[PDB]
Amino acid sequence: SGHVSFAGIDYPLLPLNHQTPLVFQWFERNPDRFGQNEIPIINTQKNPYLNNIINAAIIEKERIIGIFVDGDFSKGQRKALGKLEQNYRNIKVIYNSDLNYSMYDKKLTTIYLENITKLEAQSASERDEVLLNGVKKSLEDVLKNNPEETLISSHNKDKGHLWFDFYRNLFLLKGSDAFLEAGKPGCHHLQPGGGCIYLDADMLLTDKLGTLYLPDGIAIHVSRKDNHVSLENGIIAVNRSEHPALIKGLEIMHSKPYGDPYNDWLSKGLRHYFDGSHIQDYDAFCDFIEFKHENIIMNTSSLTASSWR
Ligand SMILES: CC(=O)N[C@H]1[C@@H](OP(=O)(O)OP(=O)(O)OC[C@H]2O[C@@H](n3ccc(=O)[nH]c3=O)[C@H](O)[C@@H]2O)O[C@H](CO)[C@@H](O)[C@@H]1O
Ligand SMILES: [Mn+2]
Ligand SMILES: [Mn+2]
C-alpha cells in the first residue's frame, strides 16, 4: 500500500530513501573513564555499542551514518573519533556543541509564570492547588539558583537519561541539516530539510534497511513485551526537518511544567498530532506509528544490560 488511515484521516506512506542518514547517539557523562586515545563510546561485552555502530556502517555502506555525541572529550579522544571517520568513510561524528538550538528554547521562569497565571485565574474550588504550590516552589528554586535557566540548559549531563533524551528530540527537529550545520564534510548529497533514522546503539542491523515508507513520514519504536504494546523511545524516523508531530510535542514541552521528552514530547506529541480528539485506541495508534523492520533485532540491551539504569 501507499496510504494508511488513522482516526478518520488518510496519510501517504512517504519514502525515506537509501540516502536518509542513520543516526546513533552517545552522550558521555564521564569521558575520563576511557583512555585519552580511545574512542569515548561504550564498547564493553554487555554494551558493545561502538562495534554495533561500526557494524551498521559496514552494512549501510552507501548511506551516511551520524554519531551524535556530547561530553567533555579530550583532544586525544576527539582525534580518535576523527580516526574512526577515516576508517569508515560514511561515519560522521556530530558534536552537540556545534549545533544551535536557541530557536527551540524557552526560559523556565516563563513556563512557570505562565502556568501560575493560568492556575490563579481558575477558582480556588476548581483548581489543582497542589500543582499550583509545586510550580511556585520550582519557580523559587530557579530564581534562587539560576534565573536564566532554560528548558535546554536544564536538560544537562547532571540529569541522567534526560540529557540524551531531550537533545535527541532536538536533533530530530533539525534532521539532515544538522550534518551541514555541524560542518561535516561529504554531506552535500543529503536532501535539504531532510530527515533521519535515529536508532539506539543496541538496535542491531542484520542486513540493509533499504527504502522505508512511513505514515506522514514518521515512525517510532513499539515494544511488544507482552501481551502488551507501548510507544518507546529508541527508534525515531522522520522524512523531514521540524516534523509537525515533533513540533507539537515541543509546544507541550514549552507549556507544561515538568514536561518529559518521552512521556510528553514524543508520546503526547505524536498521539495529540494524529488523534487529537482521542477517538481511537492507543493500541491502534501504536500499530499505525510502529517502525517495523525485519533486518533489525531491536533493543538488545534488554537481553543483556542497560547502559545507564
Ligand atoms: C526503550 C528503548 O528501546 N530505548 C530507550 C531506553 O534505553 P535502554 O534502557 O534500552 O538503554 P540502552 O542501553 O539501549 O541505551 C539507549 C541509548 O541511550 C543513549 N545513552 C545511553 C547511556 C549513556 O550513558 N549515554 C547515552 O547517550 C545511547 O544513545 C543509547 O543507544 O531508555 C533510554 C533512556 O530513557 C532511551 O534513551 C532509549 O531510547
Ligand atoms: Mn493491534
Ligand atoms: Mn536498549
Author numbering: 40 to 348
Task: Recite the paper's sentences.
The non-LEE encoded effector protein B (NleB) has GT activity and inhibits NF-κB activation by transferring N-acetyl glucosamine (GlcNAc) to host death domain-containing proteins and to glyceraldehyde 3-phosphate dehydrogenase (GAPDH). The glycosylation target is an arginine residue, which was unexpected because the guanidine group of arginine is nucleophilically poor at physiological pH. The T3SS effectors SseK1 and SseK2 from Salmonella typhimurium SL1344 are NleB orthologs that behave as NleB1-like GTs, although they differ in protein substrate specificity. Here, by using a combination of X-ray crystallography, STD-NMR, enzyme kinetics, molecular dynamics simulations, and in vivo experiments, we show that these enzymes are GT-A fold retaining GTs that most likely follow an SNi mechanism.
Based on the complexes of SseK2 with UDP and UDP-GlcNAc, we identified the donor-substrate binding mode and substrate-mediated conformational changes. The uridine group has an aromatic ring tethered by Phe203 and Trp65 through π-π stacking, water-mediated indirect hydrogen bonds (backbones of Arg68 and Ser346), and hydrogen bonding with the Phe66 backbone. The GlcNAc moiety of UDP-GlcNAc establishes hydrogen bond interactions with Asp204, Arg207, Asp239, and Arg348. The acetyl group of GlcNAc stabilizes the manganese ion by water-mediated hydrogen bonds. An octahedral molecular geometry was visualized for the manganese ion coordinated to six oxygens from the UDP pyrophosphate, Asp241, Ser340, Asn338, and a water molecule. The SseK2 structure undergoes a dramatic conformational change induced by donor-substrate binding. After UDP-GlcNAc binds to the active site, the α10 helix is tilted towards the UDP-GlcNAc by ~ 3.5° and the C-terminal lid domain covers up the active site to stabilize the bound substrate and to restrict the accessibility of water molecules. The closure of the C-terminal lid in the presence of UDP-GlcNAc determines a closed conformation for this family of enzymes. In the SseK2-UDP-GlcNAc crystal structure (chain D), Asn272 (corresponding to Asn256SseK1) is closer to the C1 anomeric carbon of UDP-GlcNAc (5.1 Å) as compared to Glu271 (5.6 Å). These data indicate that the Asn272 may play an important role in binding and catalysis.
